[PDB]
Amino acid sequence: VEQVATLTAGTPVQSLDPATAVDQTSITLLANVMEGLYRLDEKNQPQPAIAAGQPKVSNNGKTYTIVIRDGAKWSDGTQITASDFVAAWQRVVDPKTVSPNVELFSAIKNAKEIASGKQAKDTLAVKSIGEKTLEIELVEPTPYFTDLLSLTAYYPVQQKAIKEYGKDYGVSQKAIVTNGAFNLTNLEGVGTSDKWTISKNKEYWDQKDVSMDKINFQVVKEINTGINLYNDGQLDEAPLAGEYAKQYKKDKEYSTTLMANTMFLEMNQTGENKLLQNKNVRKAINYAIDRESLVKKLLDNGSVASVGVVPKEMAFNPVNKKDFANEKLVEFNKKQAEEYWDKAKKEIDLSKNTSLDLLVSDGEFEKKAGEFLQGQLQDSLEGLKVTVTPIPANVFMERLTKKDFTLSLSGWQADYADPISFLANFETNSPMNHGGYSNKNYDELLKDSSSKRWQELKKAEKLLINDMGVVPIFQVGTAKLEKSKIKNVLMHSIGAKYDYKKMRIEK
Amino acid sequence: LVTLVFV
Ligand SMILES: [Zn+2]
Ligand SMILES: [Zn+2]
Ligand SMILES: [Zn+2]
Ligand SMILES: [Zn+2]
Secondary structure, three states, X not given: OOOEEEEEEOOOOOXXXXXXXXXXXXXXXXXXXXXXXXXXXXXXXXXXXXXXXXXXXXXXXOEEEEEEOOOOEOOOOXXXXXXXXXXXXXXXXXXHHOOOOHHHHOOEOOHHHHHOXXXXXXXXXEEEEOOOEEEEEEOOXXXXXXXXXXXXXXXXXXXXXXXXXXXXXXOOOOOOOOOXXXXXXXXXXXXXXXXXXXXXXXXXXXXXXXXXXXXXXXXXOOHHHHHHHHHOOOOOEEEEOHHHXXXXXXXXXXXXXEEEEEEEEEEOOOOOOHHHHOHHHHHHHHHHOOHHHHXXXXXXXOOEEOOOOOOOOOOEOOOOOOEOOOOOOOOOOHHHHHHHHHHHHOOOOOOOOOEEEEEEEXXXXXXXXXXXXXXXXXXXXXXXXXXXXXXXXXXXXXXHHHOOOXXXXXXXXXXXXXXXXXXXXXXXXXXXXXXXXXXXXXXXXXXXXXXXXXXXXXXXXXXXXXXXXXXXXXXXXXXXXXXXXXXXXXXXXXOOXXXXXXOEEOO | OXXXXXX
């Protein structure tokens, strides 16, 4: 039996650079063609990958010492050094890089002072000792820090490759040097290609565990086509939603898996948009969304209504084991929507503009979700026109970064199992704060390191919802058909979704 | 990480 498969993806690859990759498709690819110090296991816990063991923690929980294993290698056969990591991380925090991942490094001493421009990037409290030892100093004890070290943003990059390619690093398949279970062997255009192939990396330190010779990927935007290909043996998986999920729900090859992933309506609150600057308008939008109808009828695939910004089944209190997301903080209420809208009309000039644009990805169900929301908003906010604008993923990312939007159907999947993975995105000058929400009291609640941290973060979530700085819609369930012959693929509800390292084909 | 697509 040939060890090959063709799997699916939701968008083209957007980045091949750890420093700049922030979307799920790019991150899944990087999790499979590259590797970091730690890699998540089947329980979403960081286990030693390039690192030879868990960190040795000293200095009252603030100093982490990590040893790189003997035989950890780049695809060109050269050793991965501690210095590769030092330079890689300096590169992420360097303001010249303009990395969307800079906030992930905030725990490390001087990362804040580098962000303000008070200090140079060489002050980042990370150093090599010899070629194989890393020492890191944190500002304070940070229980999830080993989890951060498993993220693609913390992956090394090869110093030689970075020196060679400079600003063109990651421009194409030829301008990277990787170190993972697979090599990227076919990818024509970053940002545009609907197909790519990865192949077993024989220079990978743990190549003995890898069975697949190659894995092909195909972007699927139209579910009917994915299913038809799947049934003809032209795809080994097919994504499902709506009527398609309804019909395949009882199939032996069907599964649905709940993700730590909230889809939002992000709202431009910089002042450019006069409607979304008004708090009553934002609250009207929130109350107008019939989340249960969306998930039952439109998605119908194990997705669930949002109860807050933070999704369910992600983070549990160490002391009492309670889910963080244990309060119903948002809920459909048509009459309150109508009333908040009537209140807003008294405060704004409707002559100027009574219209809101909604950006969505141009895939089948993203467009359909946008149209569902359009009808909900138009039905409860009398006189409001909502336009839906489906666009390609690379254009969508750029417009979010530039705040060239009004409303946006976009979401976040937790990178690690703590509420702060979500809540940090709404901090005043966070790169992921696309809407420009700013509440200084929210910012401060996020900094709590006391025995009451859990409670303080919940207060922050409530302040965000009370201001209605972002509208949570639904928590994503991933439904699909998958051929029975596919074995041992690791699927994660947090971080990079798929790990194909130990994948194999049986019968 | 950012999710522009959910199916
Ligand atoms: Zn192994
Ligand atoms: Zn269709
Ligand atoms: Zn149903
Ligand atoms: Zn539960």
